[PDB]
Symmetry: D3
Subunit: 167 residues, 6 copies
């Protein structure tokens, strides 16, 4: 069918320290700030893959696994793990890069769905995607099921939207 | 069993305009900024309900329904729609308050899970919750199923975490 | 004479925690940041009442009653307490919402004057205003005198402006 | 009686451009941001005069005279125009510095009251103050009356505070 | 030859405290934030001298001499120390203003090069410059040599740019 | 002599879009903001190489080659190109990643000098460094000379510091 890109072509890195202005509780990163950064680097990966402007259609999930403290170096790695017609699933891995002991613990994991757009603001078709290394293979292989679950959630979500519209 | 609070006791409002610094694309609110604000007001609702410090354990979903433009007044309403043992599901409704025509369209909808903590940082039990009005009843009545789906997602999520730990 | 709105129609809430980036002295909210937020929520209330774009014409006063510490949940309540021809007096109450003991102490109190504007930037007439509950009645009943004092201050202010223009 | 400082000893300048993040309406500075900066430079002047840490006790007034547009260079000049026992009246002049035609129009004028504090956080006595040039003389000569009016406002303010405490 | 301005005509002051959001390490100002502020006040001085919009062409150096701690009052003084055809060397002095002991230690020193631009974005000629006081004389007298060294650095820099373009 | 690290071990990437809050002139990135980000990613590279906390000792140069517009994706690549005893030269390349035509033009180039520190804040020895690929070889091979020129600049800089101390 369509043109294809490697998951490695859109793979994007971001390294960023945690500063006091990123925190809420004493020396601890606030979840909202983390979500902002996740969305930033995911948006960049989706832009590279689509070769276009994108918007966040939904945050499918953010799993906050570890507390993140002031001073911590965060490594964000985003990649496109699934391509629908005009939509992309972007998976973001966030690791704490401890330079004192070379550990790189997974601190958070997130899935977002982006939609590519043309210059007049309507959905635009995106290249397909294929893995190369084993990790890419893992996200690529587990994507279909996540996509279907997102489908069901969108059904229930639409019920809720319709209910709130009558009040 | 336990002490109970009304969903109305923890119900929190936030009104905030969209300023240029909130935008990415021309005059359009960036998704990350919206997620930061969602997490802020949800955290406040969870604090009121728990009577304690909280952290975001996970973002279960953010559904971005409408574009939000510079100048728009956003109304955030957070409430606790489900109480586990020490965890809370907070549902946030975000509406655009058009003061020129009194429309209040739902622009986004989000579910987050917070965990209450005591002063030494371990999970703390939270009061139960009950609805009063019809909307509260809706979120209260649809919560159990969302909770179970979150359970399954956490299973798959744990598989992914274990896979990434061997690479 | 003119169309009238209830003070409850424009009444606006804002809930927001104090984060480290809001502070100057150790764990203490900086006055400038508080004034920014006061102006934000007051602007929103004036927009709802006027059904129009507004600008801050003057800050009539900010009374800082209590120190506000990092972590504190602030509740801002703005309402229109007086309607001139095209101007509005907005009164903002700022309370600390202590979720550990359900106290809600008044931390600051502020009066601002907004002017409503049409799309080409000139002053626009605003609906009149009436109270319902007792608090609204209090601000409504004490407004005329504040308005007159603001009149005198504007006279002296004009003397100062004219003096500075010759130097 | 006490030690005295010249108004010129505490006189402080601040020059700062208006950037998009300072604006609300299209290319127009938001009042809250201006108030933050006013409070910043006023705090610095009060610190120099008192030789101590200070807090903002009240904003006595902000008069917004001109619209301020993106790109504008603002010149803030703060000085101490009155010294009570442990309190200071700081007057801030804000001018637009047009480098294209060397005009320096007064865009805003503000009076704030600061209280000096020692290291354990209680009010601390401040040096007295005297003018030299004509402008300083003007603010010094018009201060007593402003002080008395602030006294009356504080009386009414206390009535309002006591009324709100019973609701 | 051309019209001339005094170094005192473009001389600009900025006073600004260090707030927690300015820090990276515990209570210590982050270098990037300092560089942002340096560039801000230098840009303003270059605008006054050129009577035009400017852009930063290069940072010739920032020398960080002292640690700067939270709470510190920084005094920035920028001036034009050299005028090329359409370019300006701006020298910025940053001092810590200790109000407790009236010391004013030099905390940093920086040289930047700005280019003046007309309304369609091309380089525009700038007035020449002359000193009056001794400090101005010092920077004016040491400028030619810095200019020549910048010339050599720009040669090597161009070699590096050309090398990177082939990879 | 000492332990050695590859330039590739400390090599760090950062991808970040330009948002309106990053701009000064209409849709154009402000130099100060760019310098903040440069310092951020350079600090991270120096931390990885040193295995320690670092501070910016000096910005040796920032060369601004292209205008950077709102929406642009910036790719920052930092690496250690020279190791003194306890100091590091970090070179940062900033490229615009045009996803519409796959160009990656060098928009800026910068050299900074960091000093590694132990937990009580004094300079700490750093591993040596060696290149692998051709680009790394280029910066490694051109470093000694830059180091010597920095030595001379530090001599003149010290003259200026001593002169300013007598005024
Ligand atoms: C995202 C948006 C353009 C979707 O367009 P639409 O009008 O609904 O029309 P479509 O359904 O054809 O969109 C095309 C794709 O978006 C997907 N999509 C739309 N909403 C989605 C959601 N909530 N979750 C997952 N996918 C979604 C669709 O499934 C479709 O995918 P496909 O190409 O594989 O078929 C629209 O909902 C929107 O503008 N949302 C606001 C986005 C935003 O501004 N976010 C930041 C706000 S702060
Ligand atoms: C949230 C956290 C304290 C959970 O504690 P824990 O060590 O896993 O132990 P527990 O499982 O007993 O936590 C208690 C509750 O948290 C829930 N929980 C933990 N992780 C969860 C997740 N990813 N999604 C939903 N619920 C979760 C548990 O289900 C449990 O709920 P219950 O009271 O109904 O039984 C821990 O995972 C953590 O600290 N996460 C980081 C939180 C954070 O800092 N977020 C912002 C980072 S930027
Ligand atoms: C506010 C502004 C539009 C007033 O308009 P104007 O040219 O002075 O003409 P008017 O006097 O007829 O304004 C109409 C109303 O504004 C009121 N007004 C103007 N300045 C005022 C002041 N300093 N304090 C209180 N009210 C004021 C007038 O009293 C009048 O009220 P009314 O409808 O009850 O009669 C004008 O002064 C302005 O633009 N100020 C700058 C506002 C701003 O940009 N603030 C943020 C800057 S960072
Ligand atoms: C400012 C504060 C220390 C006043 O102290 P206090 O407990 O009221 O005791 P005092 O009245 O003796 O204060 C001493 C001086 O402050 C003045 N003061 C207090 N409140 C004032 C007000 N609202 N307006 C003007 N002056 C005020 C007093 O008049 C007095 O002046 P004087 O030396 O000339 O006699 C106290 O009200 C406070 O902490 N306010 C909060 C300040 C703050 O944190 N602002 C930023 C919050 S975001
Ligand atoms: C600054 C800029 C306009 C220079 O223009 P140009 O196309 O190179 O043409 P010119 O060489 O004639 O520029 C005129 C002057 O700029 C000087 N200049 C250009 N680059 C310079 C550099 N890297 N260092 C020092 N001076 C420089 C030139 O020496 C010249 O000085 P002169 O008037 O004394 O002869 C161009 O390089 C540019 O746009 N840079 C990006 C600026 C920017 O946006 N900075 C913030 C980015 S975040
Ligand atoms: C950086 C600092 C620790 C240097 O320490 P010091 O007291 O001068 O003692 P040293 O000279 O032995 O420092 C050790 C190394 O730093 C280098 N150094 C110090 N100042 C330097 C400068 N201005 N430029 C380049 N290198 C410098 C020294 O050359 C030395 O390098 P080496 O290991 O190859 O011999 C000290 O100057 C400082 O604290 N500066 C402020 C740093 C800062 O806070 N920046 C952000 C402020 S907003």
């Amino acid at each position: 069918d369509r043109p294809m890109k490697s998951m490695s072509e859109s793979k994007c890195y971001k390294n960023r320290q945690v500063f006091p202005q990123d925190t809420a509780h004493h020396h601890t990163m606030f979840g909202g700030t983390l979500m902002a950064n996740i969305d930033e680097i995911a948006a960049i990966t989706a832009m590279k893959h689509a070769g276009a402007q994108v918007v966040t259609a939904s945050t499918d999930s953010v799993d906050f696994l570890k507390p993140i403290k002031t001073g911590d170096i965060l490594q964000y790695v985003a990649m496109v793990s699934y391509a629908g017609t005009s939509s992309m699933e972007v998976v973001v891995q966030i690791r704490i890069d401890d330079v004192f002991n070379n550990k790189h613990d997974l601190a958070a994991l997130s899935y977002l769905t982006f939609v590519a757009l043309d210059d007049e603001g309507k959905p635009k078709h995106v290249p397909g995607v294929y893995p190369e290394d084993d990790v890419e293979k893992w996200f690529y292989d587990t994507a279909p099921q996540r996509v279907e679950r997102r489908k069901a959630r969108r059904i229930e979500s639409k019920q809720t939207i319709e209910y709130l519209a009558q009040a």
